[PDB]
Design a protein around this ligand. Structure first.
Ligand code: HEM
Ligand code: HEM
Ligand SMILES: N=C(NCCC[C@H](N)C(=O)N[C@H]1CN[C@H](C(N)=O)C1)N[N+](=O)[O-]
Ligand SMILES: N=C(NCCC[C@H](N)C(=O)N[C@H]1CN[C@H](C(N)=O)C1)N[N+](=O)[O-]
Ligand SMILES: C[C@H](O)[C@H](O)[C@H]1CNc2nc(N)[nH]c(=O)c2N1
Ligand SMILES: C[C@H](O)[C@H](O)[C@H]1CNc2nc(N)[nH]c(=O)c2N1
Ligand SMILES: C[As](C)(=O)[O-]
Ligand SMILES: C[As](C)(=O)[O-]
Ligand SMILES: [Zn+2]
Lengths: 404, 406
């Protein structure tokens, strides 16, 4: 019926009634739970109902529900869909839908911010070089000289028979992954495949550990085009430790803008295949996952040895000790270069709050517990002790197959 | 591709398919709509019992590789017969030892299952008094503690009988510290155990007033109220905590006992229900160092230790919490090793769980696991299980949560 959600630190309890608004289905069934899985796997009347629904959400949003503008706007969709098999959104609606899609992202812990979102309408894009410009402006704006501002740029919606506008990169900014001689990897290992694809389309490789990749933009039914980002637009932070003078000597650095760009944005039945978004980092994304994942830059042991720790046995907790300093380094550095960042403590505190604001406003909030809880010190944060319910609401950000 | 859940390990990029989940008879709390996987708690007539038992029986004979044999089909007859003429039935010695290990083996929340086949099953289905219950438990503790070289073990008391009252152990663990509710509102000792401390007092226990007073046991024989027994201190091995380099840590006077013994879980085998069947293994350092000692609603010693470390607990970005939490855990590890009591850190522990997964994959086609519970309270993505996806589902035999007997 309705799930009972309990917080074991405060002993408080709520009842998620929002989950009932879930139209789309998840991986789990009563026989078994697959919530820890990272990845998973729409005709005439389906669209119309998704559209009506979203238009209803829109007008309830501005309070002018069931009014005239609503009834008429509902006729516009009906008419357009019935004649062309599809329809279009209006700037204001698109702005509402985007914000909604972010508000419903179950894996996002920065949703307390869902209200302030700079929505750029790039639906009038007709070429990869045009895409490049939009993408470049997003960056200038979002970055704001280290004073980050969450933004999104929405490109032409998908269309039957025509190919999808796509940004081939995972994020607008990433470091190359050069699979070398001995099967080893120089740079960021999660970017080997994409770094090759760029070379293959005529990119002159590099030889560093932090070579900022070029963007492959794709306009409908046309092979992808290569564009280089103006070194100036791409802000970066040099990592140095507060008390460890020797840290900086590691040359570690990381870009300031986190901007996923391969996710599909779905609103009122429409699918936007290229709609990059960015807010700001949570220290642990850089210091824990990006730099300490064994299959990433995996610098855990180096910093360990540098700290003269006992890498001999696990029980010395060298890994833990080293991981904490690496995160501290990030927080210090970013805070030194006056670039927006939020540690996992402050961040989870705010999400905890967001769950409260949401409990009041919608009777619940979708959350993926395994993703909301930081990669280090989970139990030390309020979120670890909070039960969560996870379901799919729309508007929504979804995953989509790579364009190759 | 294969028509079973596809599981990926993102560190190694390897894949497997869980074909074992197909054996799950009991449905969980999730639905194709919403996932209730992060929740800790979410909630059998004659004819239904028979089928549960036939299932177990088949399971038994297969473990001894004799499915379809004479003993097997002759044993199934026996079970039907007995249930038919009495409404219930009994397990043979080795059938009990087999279910008890399958219960552990199936336990989706235990990261220590690699040891599943090494469990020591003490039968106690002959026990008939609360007093005797105390004797059994004392032996268990003595054997399991074994002076520090801990040994997996479980004592099984009489199974639920129609009408008659259950055998129960009121405490949540054979060994727990007292939770003294003060006047100002605070709690001296372990808040987790406030209710059980009040239940022991209401029953005649003369409380102390320490931060670590070992609770006495409230044992319950069928239909009788619970008798109150006090564990002899000599039996309850404990470990005083101290840091390997922070000389002042030993000054906090923090201590923890060596034996983790859950005792209020119902052990269910082939339909039968064993309301009192305490089991114990040994600690994973994070249980003490991060949960019991650092949780906000527990001892809550994070601020204290942070202050001792001269940390800036005024701002979060200083990571004072992450800093102290680490030293505390290290102190749990160090002190245990020093005192030669068995313990396993979250690194070794999780690594051994990956091995268990690889093993069980080849033996049964999968392994039911609760991600949120397998992944450690700290340093999560530094341990390999974080990077391992996993399927969760209920298999039987099993350990189930059960309502408090009051
Ligand atoms: C304002 C700052 C924000 C913070 C601190 C924040 C933080 C996070 C974090 C840490 C994650 C998980 C990251 C990972 O492990 O890959 C996440 C996921 C996500 N966030 Fe946010 N976020 C913010 C803004 C945004 C914005 C502007 C959007 C979209 C409009 C957004 C959409 C999402 C989505 C869709 C995911 C899930 C991505 C996936 O499934 O891989 N976030 N966010
Ligand atoms: C021998 C070493 C063992 C280790 C290191 C180990 C470790 C763990 C850990 C870390 C937990 C989670 C504790 C928590 O977060 O509350 C756990 C849960 C569990 N373990 Fe083990 N365990 C061991 C032995 C046993 C034994 C012998 C049994 C049973 C015969 C067992 C049954 C379970 C069960 C049922 C749970 C989950 C209980 C619940 O849901 O609250 N474990 N174990
Ligand atoms: N704070 C963030 N963080 C999102 C950063 C993305 C993350 N660092 C990343 O590399 N994402 C990849 C890898 N894992 C995701 C997946 N589902 O596989 C995509 N977002 N924002 O817009 O402000
Ligand atoms: N190592 C253990 N550990 C068991 C850990 C018990 C844990 N310290 C505890 O107090 N468990 C309670 C509180 N939370 C669980 C629940 N479901 O509410 C039970 N078991 N063993 O047999 O060796
Ligand atoms: C297998 C498991 O689902 C996977 O490793 C998840 C766990 N939690 C995560 N949490 C966040 N924020 N980001 C991730 O990429 C992951 N990976
Ligand atoms: C709310 C959430 O389910 C709860 O805090 C869980 C998370 N993971 C856990 N994992 C383990 N091993 N033990 C616990 O007690 C918990 N508590
Ligand atoms: C700097 As290195 C030791
Ligand atoms: C160092 As202590 C107070
Ligand atoms: Zn689930």
């Amino acid at each position: 019926k309705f799930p009972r959600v309990k917080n074991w630190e405060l002993g408080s309890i709520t009842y998620d009634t929002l989950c009932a608004q879930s139209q789309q289905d998840g991986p789990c069934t009563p026989r078994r739970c697959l919530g820890s899985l990272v990845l998973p796997r729409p005709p005439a009347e389906q669209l119309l109902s998704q559209a009506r629904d979203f238009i209803n959400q829109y007008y309830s949003s501005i309070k002018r529900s069931g009014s005239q503008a609503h009834e008429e706007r509902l006729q516009e969709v009906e008419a357009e869909v019935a004649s062309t098999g599809t329809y279009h959104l209006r700037e204001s609606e698109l702005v509402f839908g985007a914000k909604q899609a972010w508000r419903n992202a179950p894996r996002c812990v920065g949703r307390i911010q869902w209200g302030k979102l700079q929505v750029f309408d790039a639906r009038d894009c007709s070429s990869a070089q045009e895409m490049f410009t939009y993408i470049c402006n997003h960056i200038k704006y979002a970055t704001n000289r280290g004073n980050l501002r969450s933004a999104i740029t929405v490109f032409p919606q998908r269309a039957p028979g025509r190919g999808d506008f796509r940004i081939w990169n995972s994020q607008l900014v990433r470091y190359a992954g050069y699979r070398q001689q001995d099967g080893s990897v120089r740079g960021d290992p999660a970017n080997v495949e994409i770094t090759e694809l760029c070379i293959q389309h005529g990119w002159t490789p590099g030889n560093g550990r932090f070579d900022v990749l070029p963007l492959l933009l794709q306009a409908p039914d046309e092979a992808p085009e290569l564009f280089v980002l103006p070194p100036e637009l791409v802000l970066e932070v040099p990592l140095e430790h507060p008390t460890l003078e020797w840290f900086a000597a590691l040359g570690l650095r990381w870009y300031a803008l986190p901007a996923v760009s391969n996710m599909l944005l779905e609103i009122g039945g429409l699918e936007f295949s290229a709609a990059p978004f960015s807010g700001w980092y949570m220290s642990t994304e850089i210091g824990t996952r990006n730099l300490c994942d064994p299959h990433r830059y995996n610098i855990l042991e180096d910093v360990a040895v540098c700290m003269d720790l006992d890498t001999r046995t696990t029980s010395s907790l060298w890994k833990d000790k080293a991981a904490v300093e690496i995160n501290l380094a990030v927080l210090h550095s970013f805070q030194l270069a006056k670039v927006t960042i939020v540690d996992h403590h402050a961040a989870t505190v705010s999400f905890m709050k967001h769950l409260d604001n949401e409990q009041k406003a919608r009777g619940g909030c979708p959350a993926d517990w395994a993703w909301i809880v930081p990669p280090i010190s989970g139990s030390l944060t309020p979120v670890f002790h909070q039960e969560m319910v996870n379901y799919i609401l729309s508007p929504a950000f979804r995953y989509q197959p790579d364009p190759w």
